[PDB]
Structure formats: C-alpha cells, structure tokens
C-alpha cells in the first residue's frame, strides 16, 4: 500500500519530528524576557554583568534568562506587541528623575498594563537613575509639588527622598493595582544608574511568577 | 500657499467621492438577489499537521496544491506534504520572530521575514542535498509584514515602514519602493496577471500599485481600523480586505468603490486572514475568535464556518486547483479543510 | 438512608469533575490529568464498591447470594483505597517540588512526567492489592468471618497498612511540614490561600481516613463487638472521602466552579 | 559532491575483506546510501542503508555475509564481507539517495573499488547501431507494473560512458536528473517502458540500465550498449 | 509644502482615471463566478474518488 519511496520518505519525517523534538526541549529551559525602555531609561545598562531587533543572554543560578529590544521599529509598538504574548515577564524600565516625562511613562506603562495580548504576562519595573532622583529632590531647585498637587500634600506609608520614591513608585503600583484581576503581578524595583544586583532581582521576581502560575494550575489559589 | 494645496488636495477627494458616487446606480447586492445561495457549506478537517511546537503565524500553498511552507514562533520552516503529512524539510532560521512566509511558484524557493527586517530566500534544491540561505534582503527600515516571488529572481515584499519594495533577488537591491502609506502595511496581494498589486495597511486603506510603473494607481477607504488581510479576486478586477474593525469588505478595480461587507453583530473579532475560492463565490476569513467563516461573496451570506482551532487562526490559504483549504493557527497545528 | 446520599454525591461529583476537565481547553494541564485520574479512582470506589457495601447493610451484613463476589469485591475497595490515597500521596509530593524549586520543576515538568506519575502510583497500588484475589479465593477463610465479608489476614492487615496509610501517612506529614517552612520563608495573600488550602486539605484527608485504619489496626494488635460497629462506621467515614475529594481539589478554581454551574 | 571508494584488490576464497566509501562535499548523514558490476556483466544492487541507520536491506545472494554499516561523525560508508566466493569478484559502488517528496535518489555514484576473488527488468536489445544526430529509442520491460495507487511509477534510466560511473538520466520514468541535457526523454506506460534520445551526440555512446524502485531488492535491466 | 505638492500630484493622478459602472461591475463578477462555478471543488461537494484529501 506504500512504496518503497513512500516509506523511506516517512523515515527521514520521523527523525526531522526527532529532531524538532530535541530543539524543542532544548529551549524550553530558557525563559523569555522583553524589554521596554521609552527613552533615556538606561535600559541597556541596568544588566551590564553579562553582555531590527536586539537579543542578550545572562544566567543567574543556572537559569537561562534572554532579553530581548526591538530598537529597529518605530516609537508606537502596538502591532508586533502580540508577538510576546507568551515571555515570562516584562521588564520596564523608567527614569524617576524627568518629572516631565514621568507621566509619558506612566502612560506608556498603562498601555502596555491593559494590553489584551499581554493580559497574563507579569512586569518588572525598574526605576532607573534614583541617584539623579535623590540629587535633584536634595538640591530642591526642581519640585515634583509645584507641577503636581498631589505630592504636595503626601503622607509616607533622606525622609523627602523616601516620600519622593514611594510617591513615585506608587504612581505605577496604583496602574498595576487598578485592574485587580491578579493573574499578573507588576514587581517594582528602584535601582540607579550603576547596580552590581539586577539579574538577581529579576531572576527573583521570575521565580514568584512562576510559583504562582503555578498555584494557579494546582487550584491551590 | 499652503492653505491653497490643502484646499486643492480636500476639492480632488470631494471630487472623486462624487465621482465614485456618479458611477454607483445599482448595489451588488440588489443585482445578486435573484440567484440561487449557495446553501450550507460543510467542511471537515481531512488532515492536520503537527511539529510545530510554538505559534503558527503565517503559511503559502505550493503551485502543485500539495506542499506548503509553515512559518513559526519555534524558529522552524517547514515543508509539508499535505497529501501523506510527511515533513520534506525542516530549515533553522537565524531569528526566531518570523511574520511572514512564501513558496516560489517555481518550488526552488522560500522566502521568510519578520521582525530582523529581512526577507531572506532559501534554496530548496541544491546539490549537498540541504536548504540553505542564498540571498538575505536588507533595506527595509521596518519588520517585514508580506513577501510574494513573483519568479525566481523577483520578489515583492511590505514593510512596518509603511512602504513595499520590489527586490532583483541576485543583485540583492530593491529595484522599486513603493511609499504612499501612512501606516505600516500589513498584507499583500499580487494580481493573477502579475503587473499589479495590492496592500493594505494600519492607516485603514488599500493601494493598487503598478509594478512597472511605481505608482500608487487607486486607494480605497472603507474600513474604520487596520487591514490585516487582502486578497485578489480570481478575475484580477476586485480584491476582499479584513479588518479588526471586524469587516470584511469587497472592493473593485474599475468601479473604484466597494462592492459589498460582509459583516455580522453576531461577530466582534478581528480578521485575521482573508482567501478566495476557485470561482471567487466562498470568502473564506480567519478570525481572532479562533474560528473561520465562509461568506457567499455574490450575496454576502454566512454559508459556513469552520470551527476546529483551539486558538486563533492566524493564516488561511486555498490551494491552486481549489480542491483544498489550509489554517494554521497559534494552537500549533495545521488543518486541511475539504 | 443518608447512604444512597453518600453514593449518589460520590458518582454526580466525580463525574462533573471529568466533564469538567474534558470539556474545558483552559484545564488540560499536566495537573488536571492527574487529578482526572484520582476523579476516575474515586467515580470506580464509588460505584463498584460502595452500593454492595450498602447493600450488605441493608441485610444485616449478611452476604448476597453469589459467594464469589466477596474476594473481588475486597480486591476493588482495596485498590482503590490505596489508589486514591497515594494519588494524594503524590499530589502533595509534586506540590511541594512545584513550591520548593519552581524554575527546576516548571523545566522538568511535561507530559512525560505526569505520565510516570500516573504509571508509578498505579503500579504500587496493583503491587499493593496483589495478594488478595491470589490468596482470598484460594482460601475462603482469609475473606470471610461469621458470615460476613471481611478479610480475616492479621499479617497483611498489620503490614499492608505500613505501606497504605503510614508511610504514605510520613510522607505526607514530612511534606506538609516542609511546604508550610517554604510558603513562608502583594505575592504573600497568594501563598496565604495556597496555605490555607493545603491545611484544609490535608487535615480533612487525615480526619476522614485516620480513623478507620487506626481502629482497623487496633482490632488486629489488640472489645470486638464495638470496635467492629465502630469499623462499620468508620468504613463509610473513609467512603465519604471519595465524595469529598473532588470539592476540595477542584472547586476553588472559578474555572470549575463556571463548568459545574453550567 | 564526491564519493571516493577504497578496499578490494585479491582475496583468496572464503576470505573477509572490508570496504570503505568517504564521502565528501555533501551532508551525508542526510543521504540513504547502497550495487556491483562483474567484470563483463550489467548492474546488481547488494545492500541499502536509510538515512539513521533505522533500515537496512541485502541482496539475497549476500545475505548472512555482507554488513553495510556507515559512520556518520567521520562520513563514512563501509561493507564488511565475509566467506567471500568467486561469485563475488565485482566492482562495488557507493551511491547516495535521498527520499522526500520530488527528490532524486541514486543521483550521484562513485568511481568505485574492484574486488577480484523479484522483478524481472527486461531488456531486450544488449546492443543498438547508432549514428550521430539521430534519435534513438531504447526500450524496458517489467515482470508487473512499476505504476503505484499514488501515482508515481519507480523506473530510473542509468548511463554508464565506457571507463565511467554510472550517471542517473532519468528518475520516475519522466523526471529529467540535474545536469543532463533535454534530448533525452522518457517516457513509458505500466510495464511497457523506453527512453528516447534525440538529436544523439558522441558521448551519449554507453550502456543504459533501466532500474525498478518499486519494491526491494531493487533490479535493473541486462543493459542496451550504444556503439558508433 | 513639497510633501503636500507630492500628496496633490498622486491625488489628481488618482482622480483623471476612467471609471465603469458598478452594476456593469457586479454582473461581470456575476458572470465570472457563473462561468467557474463548475471548477470550483469547494462549492460543491467532491465525491472521495476524486478527492485526493
Ligand atoms: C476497607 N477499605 C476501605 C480498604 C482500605 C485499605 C487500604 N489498604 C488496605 C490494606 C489492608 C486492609 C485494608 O482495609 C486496606
């Protein structure tokens, strides 16, 4: 009923199925970073231990971690964000010291929060660049207070560099906690220009999201 | 002086929309109502396809209506045999983000692009018996959406730099550009004749373009949202377009309008994929809600639907003789239709 | 009768939890198999097993007509005790390696791994029950006693629980202990629940069955006319297990409770 | 693309003797490999081996002496013989093969080693008179029909130029092999075969085999020479 | 300006373009589909001999 061709042909489908197979389970023990900086963010340097569209590799308690910047598009990044649809995390990365772009940030953020195709995905925001923060809230010739009532008056849950970053960090928190589905989880870190710590912290946060995934699948919560 | 172009460039567009509507007397759908429907349409899953192990995202039927190229998340091109499931080849591609795939009419050569914005060939049959890279297209600013060989050494391709581009695949340099998008284009369509072409884009119109010439012939604009997918009519004179305004919309060439939508309150998706049948009666569109509807396109009436996807259906594709249709989908399989 | 009760909830659960697993594409993971499997476990104790058990109630516990039946039907309850206590056995066990070490067990974790555990907990279970059909109905003393089915083997009823409900029992203790220490040294009302679910689950499991094999064995190392009624009772207490399994591992997911609702 | 071939020379009878075929310039783990020629005789195919080593077949003459095997790391085919016979003296060749929808297997031969110690495939004339410019057809017959439910029909056209390798012709009765010319064309009905030369040519003077692949042990035709 | 004189161009090529009418369109498509009804298998349904699927 099948030829000689015919059966020889299934032979060499099954070692190409082989060896999809062996690809396969090769990068399942990877997991998948995107990174998203608007601008100015110091994103290519917060993981600076290890070093269209750009790719870097860092291992961190024999974990494979891979991070991906799409540099070659264009500013919005709406259509080719379905793409990663499926990475273990985000890692956003913003500068807390531009107050002027700081809402630019949070706007960005907010898309990205209420994506439909990253409804499920976790993001680690890194607050880059608390130094320029924590210098210029000193000196105090710039103040968030007088453009922005709302740190004006603030309580927090230096002491003006404290409630400067929790106002900061909170401006964010408040996007991610607005939804209140809980299937994903915005992990915020503030970190400076330079920080020897980073792939731990994300390596960290990588781990929580996958412990949570799955006490989801057990139906234990 | 400024103020005057914008004035002339707002009284050519009011001209032509009367234009348009001089030459409308009679709707498609008034003159398609005294014929016969096409009645149900039922079509099974003959085959499915599996090995990939990640998100499907785009596929091209072969000329010969049995082999098919499937690109994937997983980083893998593969050839099918739709006739016994066998895999002909498996080819590792250096990106891993892949949008768009296409088969040679030839059968010597595939193509792949995507997010490293670039179209890269592939030969097919080559003496050491493997596939190997021949030519990588570099000059697109933007991810590559949609590439069609028109021969061996000629290939057309759409870009998110809202611009399509005509490549000699042996010099390597783009021999045309086409820029009249605002937004980034997302489909492709060549026309059975090969010396025109269509695209839509994120900007919610669709261009004709003259290969030869260079230039935007026709624009329409009838959809609110984006286009995904467009699709040549068998004839050559019409194209269907599909939308995440979740239309579906039949345009013409030399009335310069729309036809007729296809559209339903039931269905709120987007289009993912549009396909015509031999005879150009069945519209075939994929959608995000991970089902295919078939669409009488002469009376613009829900025939059938195709419902076996666990996922979105992210390509659709008829095959040459008509006999079959393909659907991958982010589900990780390929299903034949009959 | 508050029997036909217990039968009736054990068979319309189990059911819906496999029609829940089967009809729902969002809950085919490599732990719904699993838990599929224990729901099948518990739909065959409550079906095969446990209408004769009432059945033989309702007679004075005197046995039907057909005496061959006594020995298979000691074989059935026997094994899918044992089959649903050690599916427990390695749930807890798989959760625990699932808190410990996610990374390391979401990159060794497919369906390979579900099945050998499926394959694992089934073949000790089978090895578990051996003995029974080989012995009882080659001897009709070792299943009978007064006329009334029970199996009268001291030495496998000592030892055959040791490796039942006390090893597994250790087991299960040891790995309680174990992922409370780890859930504990935003994300933290998470872990809370899942704390909370596992204590439920694990106290409920101990309270149902503990009772029965401690009172089983204490009628072997050790009066007899009560802690025979105490057995008859005790016997359903470890039954309504089999009705109770299914609620406290498939309801507190909105997916489940959306799918019996439906 | 290269095929080399080394092992032979005097063996006395009942001897073991091993051959080696090195391949070179092409991915041989991808390729299925396998024939002899007698010193006065036409082809005769001795053994296969898939691509992975997952099948393998023997001619039934060397069955239970002969062990083809290939090592892959160092891409190299071997034949291990044993209780060699006078019957064996040959000239071994190491042939590729590739088995995928629209390929060509046997595409390419080597120069071959000289050792010195069922479809019937019919081929009626052993000799054709030819001139040049001139078409010429040669013809094939088979015990049953090489035509399959699939479509297909598994006949292959050979030429061997004196002092030379064979050379695949045509594959699948119509299928024009890579690096041949259009004048030659086959063409054939179930059972019922022939290969037509047209427009003939010096160095088209040879002997062509026709060549079953329906079913294993393949088999090949006497052979018809042309001669100037 | 030069972007808006190049916008102008292509629209005023766009406008001087002849034009049919779309009932002449709709019966040509009409008439196509009519033509090929016959060769679409889609359409109908195929009996399995001839089905290679
Ligand atoms: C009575 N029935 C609830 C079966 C419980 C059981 C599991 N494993 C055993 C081993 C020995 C004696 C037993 O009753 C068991």
Sequence with gaps: ??????????????????????????????????????????????????????????????????????????????????????????????????????????????????????????????????????????????????????????????????????????????????????????????????????????????????????????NLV | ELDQLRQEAEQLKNQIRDARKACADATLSQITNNIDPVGRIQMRTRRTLRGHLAKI????????????????????????????????????????????????PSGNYVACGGLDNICSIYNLKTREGNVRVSRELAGHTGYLSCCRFLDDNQIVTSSGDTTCALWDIETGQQTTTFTGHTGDVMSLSLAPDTRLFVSGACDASAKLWDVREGMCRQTFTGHESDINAICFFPNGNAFATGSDDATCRLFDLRADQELMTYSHDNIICGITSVSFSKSGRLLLAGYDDFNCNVWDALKADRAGVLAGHDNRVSCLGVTDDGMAVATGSWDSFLKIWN | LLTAVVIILTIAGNILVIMAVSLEKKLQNATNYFLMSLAIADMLLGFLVMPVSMLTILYGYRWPLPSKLCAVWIYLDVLFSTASIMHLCAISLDRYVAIQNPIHHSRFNSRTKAFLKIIAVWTISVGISMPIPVFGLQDDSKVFKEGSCLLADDNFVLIGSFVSFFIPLTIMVITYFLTI????????????????????????????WCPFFITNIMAVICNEDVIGALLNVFVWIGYLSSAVNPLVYTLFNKTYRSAFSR | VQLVESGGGLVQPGGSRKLSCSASGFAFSSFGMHVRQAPEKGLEWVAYISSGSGTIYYADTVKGRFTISRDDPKNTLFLQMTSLRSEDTAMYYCV?????????????????????????????????????????????????????????????????????????????????????????????????????????????????????????????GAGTKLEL | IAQARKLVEQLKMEANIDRIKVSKAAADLMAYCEAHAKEDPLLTPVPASENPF
């Excluded at chain 1, 608007?38 to 961190?60: C, H, L, P, Y």
């Excluded at chain 1, 002027?100 to 949070?106: D, I, M």
């Excluded at chain 4, 179930?190 to 002997?207: H, K």
């Design chain 1, 1 to 218: 009923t099948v030829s000689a061709e015919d059966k020889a042909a299934a032979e060499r489908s099954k070692m190409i199925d082989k060896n999809l197979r062996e690809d396969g389970e090769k990068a399942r023990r990877t997991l998948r970073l995107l990174l998203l900086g608007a601008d100015n963010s110091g994103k290519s340097t917060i993981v600076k231990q290890m070093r269209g569209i750009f790719e870097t590799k860092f291992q961190v308690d024999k974990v494979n971690f891979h991070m991906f910047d799409v540099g070659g598009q264009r500013d919005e990044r709406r259509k080719w964000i379905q793409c990663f649809n499926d990475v273990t995390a985000i890692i956003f990365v913003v500068d807390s010291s531009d107050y002027n772009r700081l809402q630019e940030a949070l706007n960005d953020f907010k898309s990205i929060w209420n994506n439909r195709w990253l409804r499920t995905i976790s993001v680690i925001l890194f607050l880059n660049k608390q130094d320029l923060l924590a210098e210029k809230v000193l000196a105090g010739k710039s103040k968030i207070e007088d453009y922005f009532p709302e740190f004006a008056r603030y309580t927090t849950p230096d002491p003006r560099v404290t409630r400067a970053k929790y106002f900061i960090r909170k401006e964010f928190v408040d996007i991610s906690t607005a939804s209140g589905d809980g299937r994903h989880i915005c992990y915020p870190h503030f970190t400076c220009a330079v920080d020897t710590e980073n792939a731990r912290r994300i390596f960290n946060d990588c781990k929580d999201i996958i412990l949570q995934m799955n006490l989801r699948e057990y």
């Design chain 2, 57 to 104: 995202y785009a596929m091209h039927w072969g000329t010969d209506s049995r082999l098919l190229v499937s690109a994937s998340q997983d980083g893998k091109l593969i050839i099918w045999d739709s006739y016994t499931t066998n895999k002909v080849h498996a080819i590792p591609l250096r990106s891993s983000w892949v949008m768009t795939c296409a088969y040679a």
């Design chain 3, 181 to 208: 220490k780890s859930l504990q040294k935003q994300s933290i009302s998470n872990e809370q629940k899942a704390c909370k679910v596992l204590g439920i689950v694990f106290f409920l499991f101990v309270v149902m």
């Design chain 4, 96 to 220: 590729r093969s590739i088995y995928y929808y629209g390929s060509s297997p046997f595409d390419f031969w080597g120069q071959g080693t000289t050792l010195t110690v069922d479809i019937v495939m019919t081929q009626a004339t052993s000799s054709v008179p030819v001139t040049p410019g001139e078409s010429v057809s040669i013809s094939c017959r088979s015990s049953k029909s090489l035509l399959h439910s699939n479509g297909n029909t598994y006949l292959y056209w050979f030429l061997q130029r004196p002092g030379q390798s064979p050379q695949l012709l045509i594959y699948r009765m119509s299928n024009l092999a890579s690096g041949v010319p259009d004048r030659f064309s086959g063409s054939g009905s179930g059972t019922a075969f022939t290969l037509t030369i047209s427009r003939l040519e010096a160095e088209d003077v040879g002997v062509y085999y026709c060549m079953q692949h329906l079913e294993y042990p393949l088999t090949f």
